[PDB]
Ligand binder design. Structure first.
Ligand code: HEM
Ligand SMILES: *[C@@H]1O[C@H](CO)[C@@H](O[C@@H]2O[C@H](CO)[C@@H](O)[C@H](O)[C@H]2NC(C)=O)[C@H](O)[C@H]1NC(C)=O
Ligand SMILES: *[C@H]1O[C@H](CO)[C@@H](O)[C@H](O)[C@@H]1O
Ligand SMILES: [Ca+2]
Ligand SMILES: [Ca+2]
Length: 336
C-alpha cells in the first residue's frame, strides 16, 4: 500500500526505516548478506535478550525482565557479565551503532537482525518481523539464561517460566543448526554443533542423537560431551535434551523434515520475539524480510554412521528413514 522513498513497497510506513537498516546490516554486519558468525552471534543475542523475562520473579514481587526489550544492548554493561553472555560484546557494539544510526529501538533491531540474518542462511523460514517495541529497558535480572550445564529439568523450568513448553524449547533449538561454540572449548574455536552450520536444516537434531564417540579437542571444555565425529562439538544440554523423555519425541520429529522444523521454529521465534510486549501493539513489517535461498540438500546421517548409531530416544515412534552417506566420518571445519 505504501511506498517508501526507495520505491520499496510495504504495508505500513513504519516499515520504511527498516529498509535502510536492511541494507546496512546486509552490507556491513552481515558482510554481504552472508550466513556466518554474525548471524550466529545475533541468534544468541536474540535469545538472551528475550529470555530475560520471568513471570515467576514478577509474581515474587520483583522485576522479572522486559523480554525482547534490547536490554542486552542498552544494559550490556550488566548483561554481558552474565555467564551465558560471553563472546557477544563485539556483536552487541555493532548492533548498538546500527540502532543509534538508524534510530530504531534496540529490541526491534535485535529481532530485525535475527530475521535478516536467518534470511541469509539457506533453508531458513521467513521469520516474522514486528516493529514498535519501546527502546526503554531495565537490565535483565541475572540467572535467567539457560546454561549448557543445566539439567533438562532446570532448562524446561526456566524456559517454561518465560512461557515456552518443552516442545517449544526443542523448536527454538533449531537455531543450533546454525551454530558453533567459541567460549566452551578455546582449543576448537567455532567447532560447529552440526555438520551444516551454514544451512538451517535438521542436521543438528540428527547428529545430537548419534552416539558420542569423539572428543573433538585435546581436552573437554565447559559442558562438553563426546560428539559423533571430529570437529563437531556437543554441549551437554543438547545431548540431554535429545534424549530426555520430555523432549525426545519432539527432537526426533525434527529430524526428517526441514519444512516442519522451519514452521515450528518460526512460530517459536515469533513467540519469543514479543516476550514483554503485546504483539497486537506492534506493526507487522515482515515483508521487509526476504525469503532465504532454499536448501535442496536432504537430511542425512553423516559419515557412514547408520540408524544403529542413533540413540533413539522417543520410545513410541520409529526413527525416521534418513539417508546415510559413505564413510569415513567427516571432520567438520570450523564454522566460518
Ligand atoms: C535451550 C537452551 C540453550 C542452551 C543451554 C544454549 C547454549 C549455548 C551455548 C553454551 C553456546 C555456545 C556459545 C559459545 O561458546 O560460543 C550456544 C551457541 C549458540 N546458540 Fe544456544 N543455547 C540454547 C538455546 C538457544 C536458542 C533458543 C537459540 C536461538 C534461537 C540459540 C542460538 C545459538 C546459536 C546460533 C549459537 C551459535 C553461536 C556461534 O556460532 O557463535 N541457542 N548455545
Ligand atoms: C535507545 O536507548 C539507548 C539508551 O539506553 C540510547 O543509546 C544511547 O544513544 C546515545 C545517543 O546516541 C549514545 O551517546 C549512547 O552511547 C547510547 N547508549 C547506549 C547504552 O547504547 C539510544 O540512542 C536509544 N535509541 C533511540 C532510537 O532512541
Ligand atoms: C578434522 O578436520 C577439520 C578441518 O578440516 C578440523 O576442524 C577438525 O578439528 C578435525 O581436525
Ligand atoms: Ca532483554
Ligand atoms: Ca545445520
Amino acid at each position: 500500500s505504501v511506498t517508501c522513498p526507495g520505491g520499496q513497497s510495504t504495508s505500513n510506513s513504519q516499515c520504511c526505516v527498516w529498509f535502510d537498516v536492511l541494507d546496512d546490516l546486509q552490507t556491513n554486519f552481515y558482510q554481504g548478506s552472508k550466513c556466518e558468525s554474525p548471524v550466529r552471534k545475533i541468534l544468541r543475542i536474540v535469545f538472551h535478550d528475550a529470555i530475560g523475562f520471568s513471570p515467576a520473579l514478577t509474581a515474587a514481587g520483583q522485576f522479572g525482565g522486559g523480554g525482547a526489550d534490547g536490554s542486552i544492548i542498552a544494559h550490556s554493561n550488566i548483561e554481558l557479565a552474565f555467564p551465558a553472555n560471553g563472546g557477544l560484546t563485539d556483536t552487541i557494539e555493532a548492533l548498538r551503532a546500527v540502532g543509534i544510526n538508524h534510530g530504531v529501538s534496540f529490541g526491534d533491531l535485535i529481532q530485525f537482525a535475527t530475521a535478516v540474518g536467518m534470511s541469509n542462511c539457506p533453508g531458513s523460514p521467513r521469520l516474522e518481523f514486528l516493529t514498535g517495541r519501546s527502546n526503554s529497558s531495565q537490565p535483565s535480572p541475572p540467572s535467567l539464561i539457560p546454561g549448557p550445564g543445566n539439567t533438562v529439568t532446570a532448562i524446561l523450568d526456566r524456559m517454561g517460566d518465560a512461557g515456552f513448553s518443552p516442545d517449544e524449547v526443542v523448536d527454538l533449538l533449531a537455531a543450533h543448526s546454525l551454530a558453533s561454540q567459541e567460549g566452551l572449548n578455546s582449543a576448537i574455536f567455532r567447532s560447529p554443533l552440526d555438520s551444516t552450520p551454514q544451512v538451517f536444516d535438521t542436521q543438528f537434531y540428527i547428529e545430537t542423537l548419534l552416539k558420542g564417540t569423539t572428543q573433538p579437542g585435546p581436552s573437554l571444555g565447559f559442558a562438553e560431551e563426546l560428539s559423533p565425529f571430529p570437529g563437531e562439538f556437543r554441549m551437554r544440554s543438547d545431548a540431554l535434551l535429545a534424549r530426555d523423555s520430555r523432549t525426545a519425541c519432539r527432537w526426533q520429529s525434527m529430524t526428517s523434515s526441514n519444512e516442519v522444523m522451519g514452521q515450528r521454529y518460526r512460530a517459536a521465534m515469533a513467540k519469543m520475539s514479543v516476550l514483554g510486549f503485546d504483539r497486537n501493539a506492534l506493526t507487522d513489517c515482515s515483508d521487509v524480510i526476504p525469503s532465504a535461498v532454499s536448501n535442496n540438500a536432504a537430511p542425512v546421517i553423516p559419515g557412514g554412521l547408520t540408524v544403529d548409531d542413533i540413540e533413539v530416544s522417543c520410545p513410541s515412534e520409529p526413527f525416521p528413514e534418513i539417508a546415510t552417506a559413505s564413510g569415513p566420518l567427516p571432520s567438520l571445519a570450523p564454522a566460518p
